[PDB]
Amino acid sequence: RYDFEDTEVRRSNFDNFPQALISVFQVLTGEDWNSVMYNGIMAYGGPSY
Amino acid sequence: FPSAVTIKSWVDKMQEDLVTLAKTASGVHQLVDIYEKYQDLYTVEPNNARQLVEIAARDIEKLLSNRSKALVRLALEAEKVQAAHQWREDFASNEVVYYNAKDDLDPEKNDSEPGSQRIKPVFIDDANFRRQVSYQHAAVHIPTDIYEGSTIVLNELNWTSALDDVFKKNREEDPSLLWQVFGSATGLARYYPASPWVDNSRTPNKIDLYDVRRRPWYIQGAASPKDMLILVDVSGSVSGLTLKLIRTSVSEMLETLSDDDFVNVASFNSNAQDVSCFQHLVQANVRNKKVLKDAVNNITAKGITDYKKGFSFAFEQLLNYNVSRANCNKIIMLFTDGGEERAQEIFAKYNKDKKVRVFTFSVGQHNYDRGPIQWMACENKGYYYEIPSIGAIRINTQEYLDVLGRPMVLAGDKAKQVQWTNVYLDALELGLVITGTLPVFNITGQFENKTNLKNQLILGVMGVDVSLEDIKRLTPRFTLCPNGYYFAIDPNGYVLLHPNLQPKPIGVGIPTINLRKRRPNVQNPKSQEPVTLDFLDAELENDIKVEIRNKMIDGESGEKTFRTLVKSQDERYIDKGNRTYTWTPVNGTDYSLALVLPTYSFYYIKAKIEETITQARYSETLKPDNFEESGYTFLAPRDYCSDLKPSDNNTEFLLNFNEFIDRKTPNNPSCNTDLINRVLLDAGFTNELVQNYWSKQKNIKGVKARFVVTDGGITRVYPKEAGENWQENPETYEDSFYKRSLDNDNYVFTAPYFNKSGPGAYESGIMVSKAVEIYIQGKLLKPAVVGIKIDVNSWIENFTKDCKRNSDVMDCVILDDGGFLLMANHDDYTNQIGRFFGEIDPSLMRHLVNISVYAFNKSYDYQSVCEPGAASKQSCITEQTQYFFDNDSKSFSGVLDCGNCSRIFHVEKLMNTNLIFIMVESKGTCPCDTRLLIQAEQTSDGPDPCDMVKQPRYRKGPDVCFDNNVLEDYTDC
Ligand SMILES: *[C@@H]1O[C@H](CO)[C@@H](O[C@@H]2O[C@H](CO)[C@@H](O)[C@H](O[C@@H]3O[C@H](CO)[C@@H](O)[C@H](O)[C@H]3NC(C)=O)[C@H]2NC(C)=O)[C@H](O)[C@H]1NC(C)=O
Ligand SMILES: *[C@@H]1O[C@H](CO)[C@@H](O[C@@H]2O[C@H](CO)[C@@H](O[C@@H]3O[C@H](CO)[C@@H](O)[C@H](O)[C@@H]3O)[C@H](O)[C@H]2NC(C)=O)[C@H](O)[C@H]1NC(C)=O
Ligand SMILES: *[C@@H]1O[C@H](CO)[C@@H](O[C@@H]2O[C@H](CO)[C@@H](O[C@@H]3O[C@H](CO)[C@@H](O)[C@H](O)[C@@H]3O)[C@H](O)[C@H]2NC(C)=O)[C@H](O)[C@H]1NC(C)=O
Ligand SMILES: *[C@@H]1O[C@H](CO)[C@@H](O[C@@H]2O[C@H](CO)[C@@H](O)[C@H](O)[C@H]2NC(C)=O)[C@H](O)[C@H]1NC(C)=O
Ligand SMILES: *[C@@H]1O[C@H](CO)[C@@H](O[C@@H]2O[C@H](CO)[C@@H](O)[C@H](O)[C@H]2NC(C)=O)[C@H](O)[C@H]1NC(C)=O
Ligand SMILES: *[C@@H]1O[C@H](CO)[C@@H](O)[C@H](O)[C@H]1NC(C)=O
Ligand SMILES: *[C@@H]1O[C@H](CO)[C@@H](O)[C@H](O)[C@H]1NC(C)=O
Ligand SMILES: *[C@@H]1O[C@H](CO)[C@@H](O)[C@H](O)[C@H]1NC(C)=O
Ligand SMILES: [Ca+2]
Ligand SMILES: [Ca+2]
């Protein structure tokens, strides 16, 4: 779903298992977790209901 | 309401009044009399329009063969020269010295990049180039994203440096030659003579993004024409950054396509639909491509991915053979991200022998598997290209011509044929031009056939411009009248040479730019399209002209005479002109050349004056201090001698013209005798009128100004106060009224313009003109056009004395053909004079067309400018209406009804003139509108393309197509 029509690269996604594992570990250390969340929110339209 | 005989008798006393005022004050019969009184200052020679065409067809043959010889030698040198190049990589040790265009020429800069050394050249200013230029060496254009100093680029500037000696040998032999350029495979271009490029990279804030490979001239000689078919993956996975990239590649891929190339665009996601309205391969001209580039954009991606229905739909598209087709290289290119299926079965049958070529493009940053796509490309003798980025689009969607050029470079000498391009605006601002191209091949170790690994690509392409102003000097129109002209034509229907053709690019659609999304300082691309106006779009279309147009696309000779209607110079009138056409082929090329004449122009006047005193006496007639007894004289900016130049400030020009005859006798050993001489004879003919006739009747009452626009450029407005208001072009072969006066056998009235700026109404007045018409030995000639600006106030008084100056019962008006309003009874209408009558009472005008009193034809002007619409100027299409009498009948009675009211209008046409008189009941008695029928260049976006291409215009493709050599490498992807 991180398929936005921009040229900005989002290295922390959940495209496959290894990548998803890394992203979870990342949200766990709390390093840049808010940035990861923003992508997820934008993947569902934006800040709406 | 007065009876039909009362309007009949009252028109006949005010068309007898205008014509007597114009026959007497202008001097039609007097100027006829003095052309015939002399008989011996001139002779009457014929325009043999079989002969003239044949003569012209051969100067364009020899011009374009002379260009060709130069092209061949340059190519030979390039091939020979690079076969003896050593591929060095020590360039800081041995500098490559060259002059680089688009660099600061300031001496104090001294950048001095490694490997290279620049030149400061000296830059004389020039004519035939309207820019400063150096004839001692060739400039070099490197594109911007290409680094210079790369071993790949540094090694071109080494071997290509031997062209400056052959460049020089072409211009020494022929002074007139224009740009000479070698466009490199490497993307480096060298041209002679050297001049600074028009966009420097960073010294202004506009930056050029010009690539030689991208250029149309480079492309036509790179490779053979081609029927492509863009196949796009629109499955759900593509949506995202990748989908965004595809829409910009396909638009980019198209830029590459040409008129000779056919192309359609399909799209698949578990079914293959076709992106637009077309369904077959269409000509990929400016318009068709505009439709496809507008449907590629709206695509949405969803669903699965079936590489089997996408290539079935593609092959079927490739096999139509009912439609018009290129029939040359057949190739299909698919834009997609990753493929899990190779679709081995579809390729076995559809292309068992590999007739088709497949190119697969993987786009965006993604993890989908690329092995199957690469395999498809390898199997089909195509190529593979990745595109991750926007800056990667521009060199990969042009790069497929390295593959398509391969079976041309295996054809040998047979492939070295000069081809000439469609007219287009020059990169350097020269003007409209065509380029003849030849491809250079990479031959290294031919003697022994040693390598061939990279010997299947072209080194590059070589071109040489012909400017269209050079071809117009081989087609002289002065002997022929303003009506006569020469038209040149492709085997594609496009017009190489035409009066109508213009420098502005041909426009498509209604221009819409969004001001809310242009950040102020980034500099988008300007334009690159060729100026492809068609013969059936430069002139009003008939059915008896599509016969003429098809008959001279397939290289035949002939003549034709028929009655057709000429559109006027200004876009307001249509006049039925009995023309004769005559065409023949230019035997060296695929152009065929024609010539229009109007019967009566079959004879011209040559000046046969040679006496010392007679050429002397006629020459002080055009002296600006001597306009107190002659009339404000004008003079047309012909190229009389090579030395005195057309200046556009006419008092400037007439002094430099008339200085020239005093300071030197008109014999002038580098200057054509007949053109200047005819002018001198003419000025002694528009003198004896202005001396012995007009200066006798110094003030006629209703007459404002009196002119003789004549052939020899010399227009003479009679008082100098009046000559300030003379707002015409002083070139007599560009005046609109001059040309409408020659078609008609009756006095012609020209309506003044509505609104605008400058004094053009009460101050100058409505003008009447009439061509002079003499017979010498029973041979018809029309040498000149006399005239009168009328006084609009006086005319009103005669008109007033059942219509009152202020009448509420009924109003009456006089309208010239075309429906413009000249004289009005009310005084709320005569303020808006020279206005189209369907804008001041649109209800009556609408009815008049219905009665058959008026006829019209809407046309398309593909070269015009307009303001944008929100969705400084772009090019656009305008639709243009002109109105003209189609019914010869003199009177038209009737009544029009709007609903709940009747109005009884009576229409009478004045005999011997284009004017029409109509009497009708006052508009206020029936409150009616319908809608305002307006006649103007009206922005529009037609004709719709999807309906033209179901029955396209006839066309003839290139005879030689190079593709599918059996010994092609077909092993590199
Ligand atoms: C409006 O109507 C008037 C009157 O018909 C018209 O008139 C000028 O009218 C006078 C009245 O007799 C004419 O004499 C005059 O014409 C000249 O003189 C004689 C008359 O037979 C002839 O040589 C010619 O008709 C003509 N030649 C001359 C005098 O050089 C006539 N012309 C002018 C302009 O004075 C107006 O022209 C009418 N309004 C217009 C101009 O439409
Ligand atoms: C590409 O660049 C190279 C490097 O500048 C050019 O090679 C150079 O060519 C000139 C003339 O062909 C050589 O001059 C000759 O030098 C020898 C002595 O070395 C002398 O005996 C000759 O009489 C003459 O002066 C020059 O030396 C040579 N440089 C090297 C390193 O070999 C080459 O000409 C360029 N190619 C083109 C197509 O211009
Ligand atoms: C015309 O074709 C010839 C070959 O038919 C091309 O010449 C080849 O150019 C390549 C460029 O990559 C040269 O390869 C290079 O070799 C050097 C060693 O000097 C090495 O350091 C590089 O890594 C690279 O491998 C190759 O020498 C040369 N081949 C021959 C036979 O000379 C030539 O490039 C083509 N013309 C143009 C204008 O491109
Ligand atoms: C164009 O070339 C053709 C030949 O391809 C010329 O036609 C010849 O005309 C001459 C007389 O002018 C005849 O004697 C020949 O018989 C014609 N050719 C043939 C094969 O019959 C034509 O004259 C050339 N036209 C121009 C304008 O150059
Ligand atoms: C241009 O106008 C002329 C009107 O004089 C059109 O010619 C007539 O066309 C109608 C059909 O529209 C025919 O029935 C008549 O026989 C035609 N008359 C003549 C004298 O030609 C002509 O069709 C118009 N051209 C276009 C493209 O609309
Ligand atoms: C063609 O070349 C010849 C020889 O240089 C020259 O005499 C002739 O004028 C040239 N013609 C044109 C049209 O340039
Ligand atoms: C067109 O040709 C006819 C027949 O030759 C001729 O009578 C007519 O005058 C010509 N048209 C014009 C406008 O002169
Ligand atoms: C003339 O007007 C009538 C009634 O409005 C209409 O039916 C007819 O089509 C018109 N004639 C032409 C030539 O359009
Ligand atoms: Ca942290
Ligand atoms: Ca897919």
How big is the A-B interface in CB pairs under 8 Å? 17
Nearest CA to ligand 7 atom 3: B578
On the CB side of B76, CA atoms within 13 Å amount to 8
Q: Which residues in chain A touch residue B240, judged by CB atoms under 8 angstroms apart?
A: 2-5
B449's torsion region: left (phi>0), alpha (psi -120 to 50) or beta? left
Could you give phi then psi for residue B452, rounded to 5 degrees?
80, 10
Q: Do A3 and B239 touch (CB under 8 A)?
A: yes
Q: Do B389 and A5 touch (CB under 8 A)?
A: no
Q: Could you tell me which residues are beta bridge partners of residue B180? A: B192, B464
Could you give phi then psi for residue B403, rounded to 5 degrees?
-80, -45
Distance CA(B521)–CA(B826), nearest Å, equals 55
Distance CA(B237)–CA(B243), nearest Å, equals 9
Nearest CA to ligand 3 atom 38: B459
Distance CA(B77)–CA(B950), nearest Å, equals 47
B196 upstream amide cis, omega within 30 of 0:
no
Q: Do B241 and A15 touch (CB under 8 A)?
A: no
Resolution in A: 2.6
Q: Do A7 and B390 touch (CB under 8 A)?
A: yes
Atom in ligand 6 nearest the alpha carbon of residue B174: 5
Q: Which residues in chain B touch residue A9, judged by CB atoms under 8 angstroms apart?
A: 365
Q: Is the C-beta atom of B62 inside 6 A of ligand 6?
A: yes
Q: Which residues in chain A touch residue B246, judged by CB atoms under 8 angstroms apart?
A: none
Amino acid at B481: C
CA-wise closest residue to B420 among B217, B171, B170: B217
Q: Which residue of A has its CA nearest to B391?
A: A7
Chain B contact probe: residue of A1, A2, A4, A5 with most B CBs at under 10 A: A5
Binding residues of B: 233, 235, 237
Quick check: helix, strand or coil at residue B798? helix
Q: Which residue of B has its CA nearest to A43?
A: B240
Amino acid at B519: R
Q: What is the DSSP string of B896-941?
A: EESSS-EE--EEEE-TTBS-EEEEEE-GGGS---------S-EE--
Q: Does A7 touch chain B (CB under 8 A)?
A: yes
| Contact predicate B308/B346, CB 8 Å | yes
Distance CA(B235)–CA(B269), nearest Å, equals 5
| Contact predicate B648/B637, CB 8 Å | yes
Could you give phi then psi for residue B134, rounded to 5 degrees?
-120, 130
Q: Does A1 touch chain B (CB under 8 A)?
A: no
Atom in ligand 6 nearest the alpha carbon of residue B173: 5
Distance CA(B546)–CA(B953), nearest Å, equals 9
Taken in order B565, B566, B567, B572, the sign of the CA dihedral is negative
Chain A nearest CA to B872, separation (Å): 30
Q: Which of B240, B367, B389 minimises the CB distance to A4?
A: B240
| Contact predicate B185/B212, CB 8 Å | no
B143's torsion region: left (phi>0), alpha (psi -120 to 50) or beta? beta
Query: Tokens at residue B456, please?
Result: 């299947």
Q: Could you tell me which residues are beta bridge partners of residue B333? A: B230, B359
Three-state SS for B665-715 is CCCCCCECHHHHHHHHHHHCHHHHHHHHHHCCCCCCCCEEECCEEECCCCC
| CA R_g for chain B | 33
Distance CA(B397)–CA(B400), nearest Å, equals 7
- CA B457–ligand 3 middle distance (angstroms): 13
Q: How far is CA B880 from the centre of its chain?
A: 17
Query: Tokens at residue B485, please?
Result: 């002209």
Kindly give, in sequence order, each residue whose CB lies less than 8 Å from that of residue B522, ignoring residues fewer than 6 positions away: none
Q: Do B367 and A15 touch (CB under 8 A)?
A: yes
Q: Which residue of B has its CA nearest to A4?
A: B240
Binding residues of B for a divalent metal cation: 233, 235, 237
Q: Does A28 touch chain B (CB under 8 A)?
A: no
Q: Do B244 and A5 touch (CB under 8 A)?
A: yes
Solving technique for this entry?
Answer: cryo-EM
Strand spans (E) along B592-640: 592-598, 603-607, 632-633
